[PDB]
Paper text:
Here, we present the crystal structure at 1.4 Å resolution of the 12 kDa C-terminal protease-resistant core of recombinantly produced [name]. Edman sequencing (Proteome Factory, Berlin) revealed that the resulting 12 kDa stable fragment started at amino acid Glu85. [name] is an eight-stranded antiparallel β-barrel with a single helix. The connections between strands 1 and 2 and strands 7 and 8 (residues 99–101 and 181–184, respectively) display double conformations.
Members of the virulence-associated protein (Vap) family from the pathogen [name] regulate virulence in an unknown manner. [name] is a Gram-positive facultative intracellular pathogen mainly of young foals, but also of other animal species and of human AIDS patients. [name] and VapA are normally associated with isolates from pigs and horses, respectively. The amino-acid sequence similarities between all Vap proteins according to ClustalW are typically in the 30–50% identity range, with the 78% identity score between VapA and [name] being particularly high.
Author numbering: 87 to 197
Write the structure that this text describes.
Amino acid sequence: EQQYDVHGNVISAAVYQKFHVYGPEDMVFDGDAGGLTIPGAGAFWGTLFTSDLQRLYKDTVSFQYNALGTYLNINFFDSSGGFLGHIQAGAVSAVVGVGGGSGSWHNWEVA
Ligand SMILES: [Co+2]
Ligand SMILES: [Co+2]
């Protein structure tokens, strides 16, 4: 796995969360999750680990997050459940629990 610095944010409505991540090569993750968590908003910093960045960006369709431990973990998956990489980030207090949903990466040409 190669490592990359990333940062992001989350807005929770308790059952729904919107995630953004700003990744290397000027790419942006937009993700829409369900999950059992506290409402609120926060920012995070962390590390993206992936053995194939371009594949992560092309093939990600879904994500899952877990805040039950010491960090915020975000895993990214393809349409066949293949694991494409993950982020280890500092904890955000609006994200307890686990959850997940759809998302994808895009460049600056897409809002
Ligand atoms: Co967005
Ligand atoms: Co979407």
